[PDB]
Every structure is written in C-alpha cells, then in structure tokens.
Amino acid sequence: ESADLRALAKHLYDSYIKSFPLTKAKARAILTGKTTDKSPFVIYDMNSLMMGEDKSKEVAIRIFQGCQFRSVEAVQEITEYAKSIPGFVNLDLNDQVTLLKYGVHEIIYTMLASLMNKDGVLISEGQGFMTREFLKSLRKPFGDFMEPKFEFAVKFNALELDDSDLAIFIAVIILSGDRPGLLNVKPIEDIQDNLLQALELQLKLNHPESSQLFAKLLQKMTDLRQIVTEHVQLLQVIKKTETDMSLHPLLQEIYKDLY
Ligand SMILES: CCCCCCCCC(=O)O
Ligand SMILES: CCCCCCCCC(=O)O
Ligand SMILES: CCCCCCCCC(=O)O
C-alpha cells in the first residue's frame, strides 16, 4: 500500500509541475535572492507602478482588473491539474464542474501563499513584486481585498510546505464531497480517502520532525473557507458601486449561486 501511495504522490507532483509554471520553489528563489532566478521589480507606489507598467482610469481599478486576469489564468491551470487527479475525469460531468466551481478559489489562495511573504506578493510570473502596504493603501474597498490573504499566507507559510506537499494537498481540496449540489458523493469521497492517505504518508516522510503537520494542514481549511466568504462579500460591493466594470465570464459562472 505504501508503495502505491508513494506512486500517487509522485504522479501528482509530476502533474503539478507540468500544470503550474511558477512553483513555490521558484517563488522562494526569487524572494530570497537565489542565483537560480532573477530579482523582481518592486512596485510600492504610483510612480514605481508606472515605471513597472511595462512588464478603467484609476490605479485601483486597473490593478483589480489585472489581478482578475491572473485569477482566470489560475483557474485554467487548476482545471488542467484536476484532470490529472486519478478518478476525477471519470466522475459525473456535473460533479466535475461543481468540484471545480467551489474548489478553485481555495486553491488559488493556497498557492498565492507560495508567492507571498510578510511584505508583499510576486506578480507577473515573478518578474514583479507588489508590496502589501501599497495594496492596503488602495481606495476602499479595493484596499481590503489582499490583506486577509496576507494574514493567511504568513500563517500557512509557517508550515514550510514544499511543492510536492502542496500537490497532494490541493488534490485533497478539489475532491471535497461536501460541495453543494454534488450528485454522487461516494465516488468523490473514495478518491479523497486515497489522496488523504497519500498526503499523510508524504508529510510523515518529508517532515519526519514536524509532529501532527497533517492535522495542522487540514485545520488550515477553516481559514481558507473563511477567506472566500469574505472575498465574495467584497465582490458584491464593487458590483453595485462600479456598474461599468465587468467580471470575466469564467469567473462569473464560478461565483453564480455560490453559497
Ligand atoms: C486589488 C487586488 C484585488 C484582487 C481581487 C481578484 C478578484 C477575482 C477573483 O475573485 O478570482
Ligand atoms: C494580487 C494579484 C494576484 C491575485 C490573483 C490571484 C493569483 C492567482 C495565483 O497566483 O495563485
Ligand atoms: C499590475 C496589476 C497586477 C498584475 C497581476 C499579475 C499576476 C499576479 C500574481 O501572480 O499574484
């Protein structure tokens, strides 16, 4: 069984690497000054934004729109990864859609942590770095979007997970049998069972000194789902205050009738 679990962990890490262009490994090399990668241009105000703006008439809106395109791009990457999770594509098509609908954002903020430190977040495939203070200074409610993600990331990052850990963890998230409107819960839970087994052994092997890291990681789901509920509330505000703004269709279908 252990051999089967090792094989599963390796398959997922392989697909993860193939699906996600900017890994945590690379992100850290950029943030911490490694010679394997290149230094980011740092955006911390209006001017540095304009100078860096080489890589709807208001910086706050423009940044939001930009972040929105990246979210769309991420959903595409996550969708591709999901298909590699054994059993996923064999599930009822309606459930596949539902799993992605509720799962993508929890994964987005999980992986966004990889791009974050206390001071800011990597952007533009790691070529840029936008500071936390700059984002927090944006006119309401745009300045309220990222702060909670930073708070979560600082805590999540303390777990010191690597890409091979994350690959299994995000698979676990996708295969959540508690998603609203699931037609066949059992098949989903059977898959998650295996993934959980795989994650458990992976953490034991990769972090033999970090006791109950498995339990601690699973508990991070609480903060994760808290983030999304808060995020949704913020989107509802802008929808009413900025009637000239359009949320990307892919992103609309995700939030439509969400919780
Ligand atoms: C000022 C940065 C705010 C980014 C918000 C991203 C919204 C898109 C999403 O819901 O996936
Ligand atoms: C602040 C811009 C990034 C917010 C959009 C979500 C990014 C997706 C990701 O990189 O995981
Ligand atoms: C110039 C506004 C922000 C651009 C977002 C590009 C990707 C950001 C990220 O990966 O978190």
Residue numbers in the entry: 207 to 261, 274 to 477
Article, verbatim:
Like other NRs, PPARs bind specific DNA response elements (PPREs), usually as a heterodimer with retinoid X receptor, and modulate transcription of nearby genes by recruiting coregulator complexes. Agonists alter target gene expression by binding the ligand binding pocket (LBP) in the core of the ligand binding domain (LBD).
We obtained PPARγ LBD crystals without exogenous ligand and subsequent X-ray structural analysis revealed that they diffracted to relatively high resolution (2.1 Å). The structure resembles previous liganded and unliganded PPARs but close investigation reveals three saturated medium chain fatty acids (MCFAs) occupy the LBP at the same time and mass spectroscopic analysis suggests that these are predominantly nonanoic acid (NA, C9) with a smaller amount of octanoic acid (OA, C8). Each MCFA binds one arm of the PPARγ A-chain LBP and, together, the three molecules occupy about 52% (≈630 Å3) of LBP total volume. NA1 is within the polar arm, close to H12, and makes extensive contacts with LBP amino acids. The carboxylate interacts with Y473 on the inner H12 surface (2.90 Å), H323 (2.92 Å), H449 (2.75 Å) and S289 (3.05 Å) and the hydrophobic tail interacts with a surface formed by I281, F282, L353, F363, M364 and L453. NA3 is close to the base of the Y, between H3 and the β-strands. Like NA2, the NA3 carboxylate also interacts with the R288 side chain (3.87 Å, Nε) and also binds the main chain at L340 (3.2 Å) and the NA hydrophobic tail interacts with I341 and C285. Also supporting the idea that MCFA contacts with H12 are important for activity is the organization in the crystallographic dimer; the PPARγ chain A (H12 active) contains three MCFAs in the LBP with one (NA1) in close juxtaposition to H12 whereas chain B (H12 inactive) contains two poorly defined MCFAs at the NA2 and NA3 positions which are not near the inner surface of H12.
